[PDB]
């Protein structure tokens, strides 16, 4: 039947990374969530007229289990590398996440998108030009998202699926 895409969310902890998948999978219009519910991370969507199933792995909260990252990452066909726009360290971490994905997938060309997440009203410290320049140096798209208004969320995941389809 329909294609299933296994997507993996990676990035620094403690800076609102989990809001990206929660806002996608959510009842978009009721702010509520039970992550324990079988298939609270599966969503059927239509992208460019083609229906598919997204299976999203987001191990948010397990960042200290650093030796599990390889196993978790190998499950993915495409990756969202997420940093917080008010946390410069999370942005500086992106390079090593990308290198680790390339190693785990044994490929220099792994479908991935760079996502800058606005997780609160604290002052932005990573300007969009800095993140665009980083994404361009890697040859990947850059999407900015809000953790509160759902802006950018669909664009982040749909752009990643397009990267997979066009690989």
């Amino acid at each position: 039947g329909m294609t299933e895409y296994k997507l993996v969310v990676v990035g620094a902890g403690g800076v609102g990374k989990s809001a990206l998948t929660i806002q996608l999978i959510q009842n978009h219009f009721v702010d509520e969530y039970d992550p324990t519910i079988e298939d609270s991370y599966r969503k059927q969507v239509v992208i460019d007229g083609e229906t598919c199933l997204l299976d999203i792995l987001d191990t948010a909260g397990q960042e200290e289990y650093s030796a599990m990252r390889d196993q978790y990452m190998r499950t993915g066909e495409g990756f969202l590398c997420v940093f917080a726009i008010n946390n410069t360290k999370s942005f500086e971490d992106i390079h090593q996440y990308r290198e680790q994905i390339k190693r785990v997938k044994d490929s220099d060309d792994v479908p991935m998108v760079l996502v800058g997440n606005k997780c609160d009203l604290a002052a932005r410290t990573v300007e969009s030009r800095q993140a665009q320049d980083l994404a361009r140096s890697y040859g990947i798209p850059y999407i900015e998202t809000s953790a509160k208004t759902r802006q950018g969320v669909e664009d982040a995941f749909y752009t990643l699926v397009r990267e997979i389809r066009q690989h």
């Binding site: 809001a19 929660i22 992550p35 324990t36 397990q62 960042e63 200290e64 599990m68 390889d70 190998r74």
Partner: protein, 469 residues
């Protein structure tokens, strides 16, 4: 008819339920949302006890009420006014007779005494199971001591005197089995010869047992205070979640030690023996229901340095390939088979904590603190109940102890394991991957040969236990 209540002007907890102050879920009611006053009323309700609610509330309330304010509110709840004499009582008194005081006696028996006892039960649970509030705020403890120590009247006396003693014991603060633990097993390393301890020289049964005792102790030490509010992910995580972080760092260190043992064994035959021994340890972890240990091994075998060692994998016996594959299947499909297995076994067990962390974090992030109804902000208690269901599951598996004897020297060996040495994480994991490339180069580079490094026999003693008389 129902008992009459004090005027809500003198006693705030007698205000009628309305959708402006409490919302129930669709045989005691389950609360979706409410004001803090209504939550405390139902926490201490005159019609029924709700011990699960007491645990849920005391685990999670700090997201909506400060400890000092909670104590003030439950003291206010405790101080219930008694009703005035009724007309029948008045007429009796006017005739010099003793009144029956039927309504007063009923209100004491069916409202005051149950509510007051349930307030004391909140205090008792607070001190016994959530004492960190008092460790962190000495003045809160003084207020609790004063409140309990000045409750008058004989109906509460037994519990007041008991709670006073419990508090004093908590301020200055043993397992029985019917069966004996099995005998400690030894292989090449003999008792007291800690300098020879290593992956292949300790007995694999005893490696798994001692790691299970260690990992069980680490699991059992994690308190809900380290989890609520997602505090293990925040800037003060080392202050607020030290037992959880110690547990995770042990798991990470053991996984890295397994990887290091594998890739630093450059001889192919010896490395097969190392991997085979680690899968035997995994088999004993499975037998012991040490799921943390199972996943420590699975994580190591799926790490980038180990997973690519096809020449090693090819020589692993088929039955051990199957053991590893079935263990890995526990994690597939978002841990579907792990979750089913955890819920089916007979404890003791050591759960994998990471799933709980992700579920607590996403429950906190994915639900609002308040619900807005009729212009009022109500505390979203359903969200807190979901968090406390997870902390309750954690606690249920913390109760059962393992019937295994500690070996102090083997315990110390694994406590002091430090595969990274003084290296930083990236430097060390790059080192492991470069060793992997050295010992099994990428095709089409030829496979080199390497000298043996172990002077002792590689044959495993196996993982079935022995029993001399």
């Amino acid at each position: 008819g129902q008992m009459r209540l004090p005027s809500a002007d003198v006693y705030r907890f007698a205000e009628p339920d309305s959708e402006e102050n409490i919302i129930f879920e669709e045989g005691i009611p389950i609360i979706k949302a409410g004001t803090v006053i209504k939550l405390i009323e139902r926490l201490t309700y005159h019609m029924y006890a709700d011990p699960n609610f007491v645990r849920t509330f005391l685990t999670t309330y700090r997201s909506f009420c400060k400890p000092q304010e909670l104590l003030s509110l439950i003291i206010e709840r405790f101080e219930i006014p008694e009703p005035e004499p009724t007309e029948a009582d008045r007429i009796a008194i006017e005739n010099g007779d003793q009144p029956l005081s039927a309504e007063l006696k009923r209100f004491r028996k069916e409202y005051i005494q149950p509510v007051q006892l349930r307030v004391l039960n909140v205090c008792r649970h607070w001190v016994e199971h959530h004492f960190y509030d008092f460790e962190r705020d000495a003045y809160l403890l003084q207020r609790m001591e004063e409140f309990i120590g000045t409750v008058r009247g004989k109906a509460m006396k037994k519990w007041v005197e008991s709670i006073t003693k419990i508090i004093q014991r908590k301020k200055i603060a043993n397992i029985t089995f019917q069966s004996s633990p099995p005998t400690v097993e030894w292989h090449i390393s003999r008792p007291g010869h800690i300098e020879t301890f290593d992956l292949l020289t300790l007995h694999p049964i005893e490696i798994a047992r001692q790691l299970t005792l260690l990992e069980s102790d680490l699991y059992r030490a994690v308190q809900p205070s380290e989890l609520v509010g997602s505090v293990w992910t925040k800037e003060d995580k080392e202050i607020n979640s030290p037992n959880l972080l110690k547990m995770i760092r042990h798991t990470t260190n053991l996984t890295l030690w397994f990887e290091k043992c594998i890739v630093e064994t450059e001889n192919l035959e010896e490395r097969v023996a190392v991997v085979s021994r680690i899968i035997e340890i995994l088999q004993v972890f499975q037998e012991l229901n040490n799921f943390n240990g199972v996943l420590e091994v699975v994580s190591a075998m799926n790490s980038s340095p180990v997973y690519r060692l096809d020449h090693t994998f090819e020589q692993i016996p088929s039955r051990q390939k199957k053991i590893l594959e079935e263990a890995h299947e526990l994690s597939e499909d978002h841990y579907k088979k792990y979750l089913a297995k955890l819920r089916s076994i007979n404890p003791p067990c050591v759960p994998f904590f990471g799933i709980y962390l992700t579920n607590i974090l996403k429950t906190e992030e994915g639900n609002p603190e308040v619900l807005k109804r009729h212009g009022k902000e109500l505390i979203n208690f359903s969200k807190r109940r979901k968090v406390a269901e997870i902390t309750g599951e954690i606690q249920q598996y913390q109760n059962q102890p393992y019937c295994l004897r500690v070996e102090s020297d083997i315990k110390r060996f694994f406590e002091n394991l430090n595969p990274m040495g003084n290296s930083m994480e990236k430097e060390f994991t790059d080192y492991l991957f470069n060793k992997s490339l050295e010992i099994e180069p990428r095709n089409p580079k030829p496979l080199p040969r390497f000298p043996k490094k172990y002077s002792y026999p590689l044959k495993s003693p196996g993982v079935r236990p022995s029993n001399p008389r």
